[PDB]
PDB file of C-alpha atoms in Angstrom:
ATOM      1  CA  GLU A   1     138.786-101.565 -20.809  1.00 15.08           C
ATOM      2  CA  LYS A   2     140.072-101.465 -24.237  1.00 15.94           C
ATOM      3  CA  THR A   3     139.750 -98.813 -26.971  1.00 17.36           C
ATOM      4  CA  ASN A   4     141.770 -98.337 -30.162  1.00 18.02           C
ATOM      5  CA  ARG A   5     142.846 -94.691 -29.449  1.00 17.77           C
ATOM      6  CA  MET A   6     144.380 -96.452 -25.866  1.00 19.79           C
ATOM      7  CA  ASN A   7     145.958 -99.005 -27.992  1.00 21.48           C
ATOM      8  CA  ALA A   8     147.692 -96.510 -30.441  1.00 20.42           C
ATOM      9  CA  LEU A   9     148.322 -94.369 -27.767  1.00 16.19           C
ATOM     10  CA  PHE A  10     150.412 -97.016 -26.169  1.00 16.27           C
ATOM     11  CA  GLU A  11     151.584 -98.247 -29.797  1.00 15.68           C
ATOM     12  CA  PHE A  12     153.266 -94.521 -30.237  1.00 18.85           C
ATOM     13  CA  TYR A  13     154.562 -93.503 -26.915  1.00 19.73           C
ATOM     14  CA  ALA A  14     155.669 -96.919 -25.076  1.00 19.40           C
ATOM     15  CA  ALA A  15     159.216 -96.270 -25.765  1.00 17.26           C
ATOM     16  CA  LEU A  16     158.960 -93.640 -23.321  1.00 17.17           C
ATOM     17  CA  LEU A  17     157.549 -95.482 -20.787  1.00 18.00           C
ATOM     18  CA  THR A  18     160.074 -96.714 -17.472  1.00 14.72           C
ATOM     19  CA  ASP A  19     160.327-100.842 -17.045  1.00 16.65           C
ATOM     20  CA  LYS A  20     157.299-100.413 -14.052  1.00 15.65           C
ATOM     21  CA  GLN A  21     154.941 -98.218 -16.042  1.00 17.25           C
ATOM     22  CA  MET A  22     155.577-100.446 -18.882  1.00 16.52           C
ATOM     23  CA  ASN A  23     155.179-104.287 -17.697  1.00 11.83           C
ATOM     24  CA  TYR A  24     151.366-104.464 -17.310  1.00 11.52           C
ATOM     25  CA  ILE A  25     150.063-102.569 -19.736  1.00  8.71           C
ATOM     26  CA  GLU A  26     152.398-104.489 -22.522  1.00  7.51           C
ATOM     27  CA  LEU A  27     151.229-107.654 -21.117  1.00  7.00           C
ATOM     28  CA  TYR A  28     147.551-106.463 -21.817  1.00  4.91           C
ATOM     29  CA  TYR A  29     147.478-104.689 -24.546  1.00  6.45           C
ATOM     30  CA  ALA A  30     150.133-106.654 -27.063  1.00  6.09           C
ATOM     31  CA  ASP A  31     150.786-110.009 -25.538  1.00  9.44           C
ATOM     32  CA  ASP A  32     146.761-110.377 -24.657  1.00  7.44           C
ATOM     33  CA  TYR A  33     146.432-111.213 -21.117  1.00  8.63           C
ATOM     34  CA  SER A  34     143.503-110.261 -19.184  1.00  5.63           C
ATOM     35  CA  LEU A  35     143.917-108.487 -15.983  1.00  3.99           C
ATOM     36  CA  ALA A  36     143.667-112.145 -14.264  1.00  2.00           C
ATOM     37  CA  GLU A  37     146.272-113.717 -16.112  1.00  2.00           C
ATOM     38  CA  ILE A  38     148.577-110.473 -15.145  1.00  2.00           C
ATOM     39  CA  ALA A  39     147.673-110.603 -11.358  1.00  2.92           C
ATOM     40  CA  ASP A  40     148.165-114.578 -11.509  1.00  4.72           C
ATOM     41  CA  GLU A  41     151.636-114.475 -13.125  1.00  2.00           C
ATOM     42  CA  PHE A  42     153.071-111.830 -10.300  1.00  2.00           C
ATOM     43  CA  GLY A  43     151.114-113.107  -7.589  1.00  2.00           C
ATOM     44  CA  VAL A  44     149.149-109.393  -6.961  1.00  2.00           C
ATOM     45  CA  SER A  45     145.890-108.575  -6.765  1.00  2.00           C
ATOM     46  CA  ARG A  46     143.602-107.652  -9.737  1.00  2.00           C
ATOM     47  CA  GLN A  47     142.628-104.540  -8.581  1.00  2.00           C
ATOM     48  CA  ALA A  48     146.264-103.770  -8.448  1.00  2.00           C
ATOM     49  CA  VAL A  49     146.564-104.390 -12.095  1.00  2.00           C
ATOM     50  CA  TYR A  50     144.447-102.689 -12.783  1.00  2.00           C
ATOM     51  CA  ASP A  51     145.338 -99.232 -10.526  1.00  2.00           C
ATOM     52  CA  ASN A  52     148.903 -99.283 -12.231  1.00  2.00           C
ATOM     53  CA  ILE A  53     147.119-100.382 -15.774  1.00  2.00           C
ATOM     54  CA  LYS A  54     145.079 -96.714 -15.192  1.00  2.00           C
ATOM     55  CA  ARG A  55     147.922 -95.042 -14.082  1.00  2.00           C
ATOM     56  CA  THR A  56     150.469 -96.045 -17.327  1.00  2.00           C
ATOM     57  CA  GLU A  57     147.120 -94.868 -19.524  1.00  2.00           C
ATOM     58  CA  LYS A  58     147.072 -91.287 -17.429  1.00  2.00           C
ATOM     59  CA  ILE A  59     150.697 -90.995 -18.795  1.00  2.00           C
ATOM     60  CA  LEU A  60     150.003 -91.927 -22.084  1.00  2.00           C
ATOM     61  CA  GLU A  61     147.341 -89.214 -22.547  1.00  2.00           C
ATOM     62  CA  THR A  62     149.576 -86.781 -21.020  1.00  2.00           C
ATOM     63  CA  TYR A  63     152.120 -87.332 -23.627  1.00  2.00           C
ATOM     64  CA  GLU A  64     149.238 -87.202 -26.324  1.00  2.00           C
ATOM     65  CA  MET A  65     148.166 -83.803 -25.216  1.00  2.00           C
ATOM     66  CA  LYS A  66     151.738 -82.581 -25.443  1.00  2.00           C
ATOM     67  CA  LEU A  67     153.158 -83.934 -28.844  1.00  2.00           C
ATOM     68  CA  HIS A  68     149.877 -84.776 -30.518  1.00  2.00           C
ATOM     69  CA  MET A  69     151.060 -88.082 -32.512  1.00  2.00           C
ATOM     70  CA  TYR A  70     147.608 -89.380 -32.182  1.00  2.00           C
ATOM     71  CA  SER A  71     144.948 -86.789 -33.001  1.00  2.00           C
ATOM     72  CA  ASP A  72     147.501 -85.844 -36.064  1.00  2.00           C
ATOM     73  CA  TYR A  73     147.636 -89.407 -37.450  1.00  2.00           C
ATOM     74  CA  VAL A  74     143.468 -89.249 -37.137  1.00  2.00           C
ATOM     75  CA  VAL A  75     143.351 -85.765 -38.896  1.00  2.00           C
ATOM     76  CA  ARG A  76     145.862 -87.233 -41.969  1.00  2.00           C
ATOM     77  CA  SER A  77     144.114 -90.471 -42.948  1.00  2.00           C
ATOM     78  CA  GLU A  78     141.023 -88.448 -42.944  1.00  2.00           C
ATOM     79  CA  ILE A  79     142.385 -86.074 -45.153  1.00  2.00           C
ATOM     80  CA  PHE A  80     144.198 -88.639 -47.278  1.00  2.00           C
ATOM     81  CA  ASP A  81     141.000 -90.574 -47.957  1.00  2.00           C
ATOM     82  CA  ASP A  82     139.263 -87.149 -48.906  1.00  2.00           C
ATOM     83  CA  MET A  83     141.924 -87.325 -51.257  1.00  2.00           C
ATOM     84  CA  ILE A  84     141.652 -90.602 -52.300  1.00  2.00           C
ATOM     85  CA  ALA A  85     137.742 -90.123 -53.179  1.00  2.00           C
ATOM     86  CA  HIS A  86     138.494 -87.142 -54.900  1.00  2.00           C
ATOM     87  CA  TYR A  87     141.155 -88.412 -57.520  1.00  2.00           C
ATOM     88  CA  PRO A  88     140.236 -92.269 -57.775  1.00  2.00           C
ATOM     89  CA  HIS A  89     142.177 -92.521 -60.996  1.00  2.00           C
ATOM     90  CA  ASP A  90     145.136 -90.634 -60.221  1.00  2.00           C
ATOM     91  CA  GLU A  91     148.203 -93.144 -60.444  1.00  2.00           C
ATOM     92  CA  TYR A  92     151.076 -90.678 -59.101  1.00  2.00           C
ATOM     93  CA  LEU A  93     148.313 -89.364 -56.048  1.00  2.00           C
ATOM     94  CA  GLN A  94     147.506 -93.113 -54.899  1.00  2.00           C
ATOM     95  CA  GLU A  95     150.789 -93.866 -54.626  1.00  2.00           C
ATOM     96  CA  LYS A  96     151.625 -90.717 -52.598  1.00  2.00           C
ATOM     97  CA  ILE A  97     148.972 -91.664 -50.601  1.00  2.00           C
ATOM     98  CA  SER A  98     150.425 -95.230 -50.284  1.00  2.00           C
ATOM     99  CA  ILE A  99     153.661 -93.621 -48.961  1.00  2.00           C
ATOM    100  CA  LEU A 100     152.551 -91.045 -46.443  1.00  2.00           C
ATOM    101  CA  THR A 101     150.465 -93.304 -44.920  1.00  2.00           C
ATOM    102  CA  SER A 102     153.072 -95.835 -44.566  1.00  2.00           C
ATOM    103  CA  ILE A 103     155.087 -93.310 -43.161  1.00  2.00           C
ATOM    104  CA  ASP A 104     152.350 -92.308 -40.691  1.00  2.00           C
ATOM    105  CA  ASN A 105     151.975 -96.333 -39.595  1.00  2.00           C
ATOM    106  CA  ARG A 106     155.529 -96.380 -39.132  1.00  2.00           C
TER     107      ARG A 106
ATOM    108  CA  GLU B   1     144.823 -91.076 -84.481  1.00  2.00           C
ATOM    109  CA  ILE B   2     146.673 -92.386 -81.660  1.00  2.00           C
ATOM    110  CA  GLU B   3     148.801 -90.359 -79.214  1.00  2.00           C
ATOM    111  CA  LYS B   4     152.173 -91.391 -78.350  1.00  2.00           C
ATOM    112  CA  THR B   5     152.686 -90.009 -74.611  1.00  2.00           C
ATOM    113  CA  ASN B   6     156.093 -90.937 -72.475  1.00  2.00           C
ATOM    114  CA  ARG B   7     154.316 -92.674 -69.888  1.00  2.00           C
ATOM    115  CA  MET B   8     153.072 -94.756 -72.705  1.00  2.00           C
ATOM    116  CA  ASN B   9     156.312 -94.962 -74.265  1.00  2.00           C
ATOM    117  CA  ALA B  10     157.630 -96.292 -70.541  1.00  2.00           C
ATOM    118  CA  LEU B  11     154.634 -98.681 -70.201  1.00  2.00           C
ATOM    119  CA  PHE B  12     155.572-100.473 -73.454  1.00  2.00           C
ATOM    120  CA  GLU B  13     159.154-100.262 -72.819  1.00  2.00           C
ATOM    121  CA  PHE B  14     158.675-101.620 -68.707  1.00  2.00           C
ATOM    122  CA  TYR B  15     156.353-104.510 -70.236  1.00  2.00           C
ATOM    123  CA  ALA B  16     157.168-105.623 -73.245  1.00  2.00           C
ATOM    124  CA  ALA B  17     158.470-108.647 -72.767  1.00  2.00           C
ATOM    125  CA  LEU B  18     154.968-109.708 -71.044  1.00  2.00           C
ATOM    126  CA  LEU B  19     153.129-109.300 -74.790  1.00  2.00           C
ATOM    127  CA  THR B  20     152.513-112.023 -76.708  1.00  2.00           C
ATOM    128  CA  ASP B  21     154.030-111.282 -80.252  1.00  2.00           C
ATOM    129  CA  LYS B  22     150.788-110.294 -81.811  1.00  2.00           C
ATOM    130  CA  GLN B  23     150.428-108.102 -79.211  1.00  2.00           C
ATOM    131  CA  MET B  24     153.760-106.161 -79.445  1.00  2.00           C
ATOM    132  CA  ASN B  25     155.198-106.101 -83.500  1.00  2.00           C
ATOM    133  CA  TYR B  26     152.556-103.174 -84.219  1.00  2.00           C
ATOM    134  CA  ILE B  27     153.435-101.163 -81.274  1.00  2.00           C
ATOM    135  CA  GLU B  28     156.970-101.912 -81.146  1.00  2.00           C
ATOM    136  CA  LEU B  29     157.151-100.471 -84.830  1.00  2.00           C
ATOM    137  CA  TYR B  30     154.718 -97.077 -83.863  1.00  2.00           C
ATOM    138  CA  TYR B  31     157.196 -96.153 -80.138  1.00  2.00           C
ATOM    139  CA  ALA B  32     160.335 -97.499 -81.302  1.00  2.00           C
ATOM    140  CA  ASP B  33     160.682 -97.011 -85.163  1.00  2.00           C
ATOM    141  CA  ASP B  34     158.275 -94.362 -85.113  1.00  2.00           C
ATOM    142  CA  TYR B  35     156.413 -96.128 -87.807  1.00  2.00           C
ATOM    143  CA  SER B  36     152.928 -94.380 -89.132  1.00  2.00           C
ATOM    144  CA  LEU B  37     150.305 -96.941 -88.757  1.00  2.00           C
ATOM    145  CA  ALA B  38     149.788 -96.584 -92.447  1.00  2.00           C
ATOM    146  CA  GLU B  39     153.232 -98.016 -93.250  1.00  2.00           C
ATOM    147  CA  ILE B  40     153.037-100.752 -90.469  1.00  2.18           C
ATOM    148  CA  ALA B  41     150.087-102.230 -92.382  1.00  4.49           C
ATOM    149  CA  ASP B  42     151.554-101.726 -95.151  1.00  6.62           C
ATOM    150  CA  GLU B  43     154.211-103.741 -94.397  1.00 11.15           C
ATOM    151  CA  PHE B  44     152.564-106.697 -92.331  1.00 10.26           C
ATOM    152  CA  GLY B  45     149.854-106.435 -95.635  1.00  7.00           C
ATOM    153  CA  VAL B  46     146.740-105.622 -93.069  1.00  8.87           C
ATOM    154  CA  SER B  47     144.436-102.906 -92.864  1.00 10.35           C
ATOM    155  CA  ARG B  48     145.021 -99.883 -90.970  1.00  7.90           C
ATOM    156  CA  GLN B  49     142.317-100.286 -89.063  1.00  7.42           C
ATOM    157  CA  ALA B  50     143.432-103.138 -88.365  1.00  7.24           C
ATOM    158  CA  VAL B  51     146.783-102.121 -87.298  1.00  5.72           C
ATOM    159  CA  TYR B  52     144.919 -99.077 -84.867  1.00  8.19           C
ATOM    160  CA  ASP B  53     142.757-101.298 -83.155  1.00 11.53           C
ATOM    161  CA  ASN B  54     145.155-103.638 -82.625  1.00 10.78           C
ATOM    162  CA  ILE B  55     147.490-100.518 -81.136  1.00  9.45           C
ATOM    163  CA  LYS B  56     144.654 -99.710 -78.628  1.00  9.24           C
ATOM    164  CA  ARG B  57     144.401-103.001 -77.366  1.00  6.21           C
ATOM    165  CA  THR B  58     147.848-103.014 -76.335  1.00 11.21           C
ATOM    166  CA  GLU B  59     147.831-100.081 -74.882  1.00  7.21           C
ATOM    167  CA  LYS B  60     144.922-101.047 -72.198  1.00  8.29           C
ATOM    168  CA  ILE B  61     147.019-104.151 -72.135  1.00  9.16           C
ATOM    169  CA  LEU B  62     149.699-102.179 -70.761  1.00  7.53           C
ATOM    170  CA  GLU B  63     147.792-100.190 -68.443  1.00  9.69           C
ATOM    171  CA  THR B  64     146.556-103.115 -66.931  1.00 13.03           C
ATOM    172  CA  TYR B  65     150.116-104.545 -66.255  1.00 10.79           C
ATOM    173  CA  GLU B  66     150.532-100.953 -64.802  1.00 13.50           C
ATOM    174  CA  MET B  67     147.709-100.903 -62.540  1.00 15.50           C
ATOM    175  CA  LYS B  68     148.806-104.378 -60.958  1.00 15.17           C
ATOM    176  CA  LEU B  69     152.662-103.536 -60.939  1.00 19.23           C
ATOM    177  CA  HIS B  70     153.294-100.010 -60.673  1.00 19.38           C
ATOM    178  CA  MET B  71     156.372-100.270 -62.285  1.00 17.51           C
ATOM    179  CA  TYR B  72     156.268 -96.863 -64.066  1.00 21.01           C
ATOM    180  CA  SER B  73     154.686 -95.003 -60.424  1.00 23.95           C
ATOM    181  CA  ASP B  74     157.383 -96.438 -58.488  1.00 25.82           C
ATOM    182  CA  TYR B  75     159.891 -95.416 -61.318  1.00 29.02           C
ATOM    183  CA  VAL B  76     158.581 -91.603 -61.089  1.00 27.38           C
ATOM    184  CA  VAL B  77     158.992 -91.896 -57.128  1.00 32.51           C
ATOM    185  CA  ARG B  78     162.611 -93.339 -56.782  1.00 31.21           C
ATOM    186  CA  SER B  79     163.727 -90.413 -59.325  1.00 29.91           C
ATOM    187  CA  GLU B  80     161.823 -87.822 -57.374  1.00 25.23           C
ATOM    188  CA  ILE B  81     163.583 -89.251 -54.236  1.00 25.70           C
ATOM    189  CA  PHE B  82     167.179 -89.419 -55.212  1.00 27.58           C
ATOM    190  CA  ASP B  83     166.579 -85.708 -56.691  1.00 31.11           C
ATOM    191  CA  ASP B  84     165.580 -85.032 -53.045  1.00 30.17           C
ATOM    192  CA  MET B  85     168.950 -87.026 -51.603  1.00 31.42           C
ATOM    193  CA  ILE B  86     171.014 -85.187 -54.422  1.00 33.08           C
ATOM    194  CA  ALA B  87     169.579 -81.692 -53.172  1.00 32.32           C
ATOM    195  CA  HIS B  88     170.507 -83.092 -49.408  1.00 35.01           C
ATOM    196  CA  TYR B  89     173.883 -83.738 -50.084  1.00 29.66           C
ATOM    197  CA  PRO B  90     175.380 -81.309 -53.040  1.00 29.52           C
ATOM    198  CA  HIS B  91     179.186 -82.059 -52.162  1.00 30.31           C
ATOM    199  CA  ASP B  92     178.885 -85.830 -51.577  1.00 25.61           C
ATOM    200  CA  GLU B  93     180.738 -87.874 -54.431  1.00 25.37           C
ATOM    201  CA  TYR B  94     179.941 -90.974 -52.345  1.00 24.93           C
ATOM    202  CA  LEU B  95     176.321 -89.896 -51.962  1.00 25.47           C
ATOM    203  CA  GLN B  96     176.326 -88.629 -55.873  1.00 22.55           C
ATOM    204  CA  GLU B  97     178.341 -92.275 -57.200  1.00 19.97           C
ATOM    205  CA  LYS B  98     175.469 -94.628 -55.655  1.00 20.90           C
ATOM    206  CA  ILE B  99     172.567 -92.542 -56.829  1.00 18.63           C
ATOM    207  CA  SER B 100     174.216 -92.400 -60.127  1.00 17.82           C
ATOM    208  CA  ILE B 101     174.408 -96.770 -59.950  1.00 13.74           C
ATOM    209  CA  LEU B 102     170.555 -96.745 -58.223  1.00 12.55           C
ATOM    210  CA  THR B 103     169.534 -94.530 -61.551  1.00 14.51           C
ATOM    211  CA  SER B 104     171.242 -96.373 -63.752  1.00 15.85           C
ATOM    212  CA  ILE B 105     169.661-100.176 -62.670  1.00 16.44           C
ATOM    213  CA  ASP B 106     166.330 -97.928 -62.821  1.00 15.22           C
ATOM    214  CA  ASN B 107     167.614 -96.893 -66.635  1.00 15.99           C
ATOM    215  CA  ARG B 108     168.007-101.265 -66.839  1.00 14.09           C
TER     216      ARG B 108
ATOM    217  CA  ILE C   1     157.991-128.556 -51.417  1.00 15.42           C
ATOM    218  CA  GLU C   2     160.804-126.904 -50.230  1.00 11.06           C
ATOM    219  CA  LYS C   3     159.789-123.489 -49.408  1.00 11.74           C
ATOM    220  CA  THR C   4     162.079-120.291 -50.368  1.00 13.80           C
ATOM    221  CA  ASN C   5     162.481-116.834 -49.366  1.00 16.74           C
ATOM    222  CA  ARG C   6     162.885-116.007 -52.701  1.00 16.30           C
ATOM    223  CA  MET C   7     159.617-118.082 -54.219  1.00 20.35           C
ATOM    224  CA  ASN C   8     157.888-116.124 -51.770  1.00 22.56           C
ATOM    225  CA  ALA C   9     158.928-112.581 -52.749  1.00 21.27           C
ATOM    226  CA  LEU C  10     158.524-114.185 -56.748  1.00 22.20           C
ATOM    227  CA  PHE C  11     154.631-115.146 -55.420  1.00 20.36           C
ATOM    228  CA  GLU C  12     154.330-111.367 -53.410  1.00 20.37           C
ATOM    229  CA  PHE C  13     155.737-109.106 -56.899  1.00 16.75           C
ATOM    230  CA  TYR C  14     154.095-110.973 -59.747  1.00 16.56           C
ATOM    231  CA  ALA C  15     150.671-112.465 -57.461  1.00 17.63           C
ATOM    232  CA  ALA C  16     148.274-110.239 -59.351  1.00 17.10           C
ATOM    233  CA  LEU C  17     149.150-111.682 -62.759  1.00 11.79           C
ATOM    234  CA  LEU C  18     147.982-114.722 -61.575  1.00 11.53           C
ATOM    235  CA  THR C  19     144.471-116.326 -62.313  1.00  8.43           C
ATOM    236  CA  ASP C  20     142.363-117.359 -59.651  1.00  7.52           C
ATOM    237  CA  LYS C  21     142.967-120.748 -60.742  1.00  7.64           C
ATOM    238  CA  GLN C  22     146.791-120.042 -60.618  1.00  6.15           C
ATOM    239  CA  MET C  23     146.916-118.654 -57.082  1.00  3.89           C
ATOM    240  CA  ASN C  24     144.530-120.359 -55.101  1.00  4.93           C
ATOM    241  CA  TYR C  25     146.895-123.447 -54.399  1.00  4.87           C
ATOM    242  CA  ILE C  26     150.443-121.239 -53.402  1.00  2.99           C
ATOM    243  CA  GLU C  27     148.513-118.504 -51.609  1.00  2.87           C
ATOM    244  CA  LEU C  28     147.622-120.514 -49.252  1.00  4.49           C
ATOM    245  CA  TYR C  29     150.583-122.521 -48.986  1.00  2.21           C
ATOM    246  CA  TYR C  30     152.855-119.387 -48.682  1.00  2.00           C
ATOM    247  CA  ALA C  31     150.452-116.681 -47.283  1.00  2.00           C
ATOM    248  CA  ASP C  32     148.896-119.032 -44.597  1.00  4.96           C
ATOM    249  CA  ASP C  33     151.242-121.965 -44.542  1.00  5.03           C
ATOM    250  CA  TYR C  34     149.274-124.772 -44.812  1.00  5.21           C
ATOM    251  CA  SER C  35     150.167-128.233 -46.370  1.00  8.18           C
ATOM    252  CA  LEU C  36     149.898-129.693 -49.279  1.00 12.02           C
ATOM    253  CA  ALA C  37     147.484-132.232 -47.521  1.00 11.14           C
ATOM    254  CA  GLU C  38     145.321-129.213 -46.034  1.00 10.50           C
ATOM    255  CA  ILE C  39     145.163-127.847 -49.131  1.00 12.15           C
ATOM    256  CA  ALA C  40     144.209-131.064 -51.278  1.00 11.27           C
ATOM    257  CA  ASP C  41     141.029-131.221 -48.593  1.00 15.24           C
ATOM    258  CA  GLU C  42     139.903-127.932 -48.605  1.00 14.76           C
ATOM    259  CA  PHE C  43     139.380-127.828 -52.264  1.00 16.54           C
ATOM    260  CA  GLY C  44     138.294-131.843 -52.436  1.00 16.90           C
ATOM    261  CA  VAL C  45     141.097-132.904 -54.595  1.00 17.05           C
ATOM    262  CA  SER C  46     144.420-135.325 -54.274  1.00 17.73           C
ATOM    263  CA  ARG C  47     147.838-134.191 -53.138  1.00 17.85           C
ATOM    264  CA  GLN C  48     149.211-135.062 -56.374  1.00 14.12           C
ATOM    265  CA  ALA C  49     147.163-132.183 -58.204  1.00 15.89           C
ATOM    266  CA  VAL C  50     147.948-129.698 -55.476  1.00 14.47           C
ATOM    267  CA  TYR C  51     151.626-130.485 -55.588  1.00 16.36           C
ATOM    268  CA  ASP C  52     151.205-130.223 -59.699  1.00 15.96           C
ATOM    269  CA  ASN C  53     149.495-126.759 -59.701  1.00 13.23           C
ATOM    270  CA  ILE C  54     151.962-125.417 -57.207  1.00 14.76           C
ATOM    271  CA  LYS C  55     154.855-126.394 -59.453  1.00 17.87           C
ATOM    272  CA  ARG C  56     153.308-125.119 -62.205  1.00 21.01           C
ATOM    273  CA  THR C  57     152.512-122.078 -60.902  1.00 21.96           C
ATOM    274  CA  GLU C  58     156.428-121.634 -59.482  1.00 23.25           C
ATOM    275  CA  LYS C  59     157.328-122.072 -63.452  1.00 26.19           C
ATOM    276  CA  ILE C  60     154.745-118.804 -64.236  1.00 25.67           C
ATOM    277  CA  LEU C  61     156.322-116.988 -61.228  1.00 24.27           C
ATOM    278  CA  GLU C  62     159.751-117.938 -62.555  1.00 22.99           C
ATOM    279  CA  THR C  63     159.347-116.821 -66.149  1.00 21.42           C
ATOM    280  CA  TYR C  64     158.041-113.461 -64.824  1.00 21.05           C
ATOM    281  CA  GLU C  65     160.916-112.671 -62.925  1.00 20.28           C
ATOM    282  CA  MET C  66     163.009-113.405 -66.051  1.00 20.35           C
ATOM    283  CA  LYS C  67     161.338-111.250 -68.174  1.00 22.84           C
ATOM    284  CA  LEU C  68     161.030-108.568 -65.078  1.00 22.60           C
ATOM    285  CA  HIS C  69     163.610-108.666 -63.055  1.00 25.05           C
ATOM    286  CA  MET C  70     161.649-107.114 -59.972  1.00 26.16           C
ATOM    287  CA  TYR C  71     163.037-109.563 -57.368  1.00 23.77           C
ATOM    288  CA  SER C  72     166.491-109.263 -58.484  1.00 25.09           C
ATOM    289  CA  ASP C  73     166.439-105.795 -58.953  1.00 24.98           C
ATOM    290  CA  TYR C  74     165.346-105.490 -55.435  1.00 27.81           C
ATOM    291  CA  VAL C  75     167.809-107.485 -53.995  1.00 29.53           C
ATOM    292  CA  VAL C  76     170.264-105.727 -56.292  1.00 27.65           C
ATOM    293  CA  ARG C  77     169.313-102.352 -54.531  1.00 29.98           C
ATOM    294  CA  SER C  78     169.109-103.539 -51.063  1.00 30.95           C
ATOM    295  CA  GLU C  79     173.037-104.587 -51.511  1.00 33.16           C
ATOM    296  CA  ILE C  80     173.237-100.665 -52.649  1.00 33.03           C
ATOM    297  CA  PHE C  81     171.244 -99.425 -49.338  1.00 35.68           C
ATOM    298  CA  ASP C  82     173.095-101.741 -47.154  1.00 36.26           C
ATOM    299  CA  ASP C  83     176.450-100.495 -48.420  1.00 35.87           C
ATOM    300  CA  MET C  84     174.989 -96.798 -47.984  1.00 35.15           C
ATOM    301  CA  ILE C  85     173.538 -97.527 -44.259  1.00 31.81           C
ATOM    302  CA  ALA C  86     177.086 -98.986 -43.611  1.00 32.24           C
ATOM    303  CA  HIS C  87     179.265 -95.712 -45.193  1.00 33.81           C
ATOM    304  CA  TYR C  88     176.717 -93.532 -42.870  1.00 30.04           C
ATOM    305  CA  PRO C  89     175.292 -95.301 -39.679  1.00 32.42           C
ATOM    306  CA  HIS C  90     174.284 -91.937 -38.093  1.00 29.83           C
ATOM    307  CA  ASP C  91     172.625 -90.331 -40.717  1.00 31.48           C
ATOM    308  CA  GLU C  92     169.139 -90.116 -40.163  1.00 34.03           C
ATOM    309  CA  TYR C  93     168.032 -88.946 -43.045  1.00 32.88           C
ATOM    310  CA  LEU C  94     169.606 -91.211 -45.016  1.00 33.78           C
ATOM    311  CA  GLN C  95     168.363 -94.192 -42.945  1.00 34.15           C
ATOM    312  CA  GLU C  96     164.317 -92.827 -43.665  1.00 39.11           C
ATOM    313  CA  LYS C  97     165.131 -92.412 -47.370  1.00 39.56           C
ATOM    314  CA  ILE C  98     166.115 -96.004 -47.718  1.00 42.82           C
ATOM    315  CA  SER C  99     163.167 -96.890 -45.177  1.00 40.87           C
ATOM    316  CA  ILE C 100     160.980 -95.442 -47.875  1.00 44.38           C
ATOM    317  CA  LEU C 101     162.371 -96.931 -50.905  1.00 48.10           C
ATOM    318  CA  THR C 102     162.817-100.375 -49.115  1.00 51.95           C
ATOM    319  CA  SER C 103     158.897 -99.905 -48.479  1.00 50.37           C
ATOM    320  CA  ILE C 104     157.953 -98.351 -52.093  1.00 49.20           C
ATOM    321  CA  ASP C 105     159.498-102.159 -53.192  1.00 45.34           C
TER     322      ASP C 105
END
């Protein structure tokens, strides 16, 4: 249970999470532990880790419904790609897109 | 017929040092000293066609350097951002002095 | 060969000017952290050949830096950007401008 969108929601909103909401999912998304490894580290069950992570995932979705940083990031990249495809030899536009893209990736 | 432009003049100023002597001598007289193709050819004892083809060769080389290093487009962007900053801080003398220092490192 | 932040940066600024033959080894050395031995094993050559070729590319990079000054201009601007941030530590719009200027570079 790992997807690019949810990974992205985690990267966008992690700073909004509490410690308790954060711990497991951070280990899973950023440090790369399996749920078993997380359960072993904490002396808890595998389902427990699964349950905690699922709750935080709904929270991340709630933030996405409110702020839309992910859907808006997707829309912009698609528009930037169209622009690039449209103006393959315009240096000034390519640099603009380069800066926007970097602002979006930060 | 070779059309001078501000971008091309700027690529030359940015990348001149990368050119070999033969790549640089004619285009330098053309842009920096406003020589005609005929005058260059007369000075060096060669045909106008030869000067013409040489300058076109360099122009392509300059355009390849820009595609690799982007000193010109980066310079355009920096000045736009500096202009933004000046409009944002109309009366900040300190900011104004900084921008003026950055601008001159950019103008060398 | 002592690695430095400066040479790393020279490589990063001018690599596009290098031929594959000038770039192959130094690229592995700096970007991928290969040792000279690993590089030599990969290309089936001696360590000395690897050592000579990197030293040569380094010299070529130093030449680009002396002609173009991209790295020194970057170090000087950075210093000017640091003065500005020290001057206005709580100015987000300024901070943002500086991050962009810095990434352009």
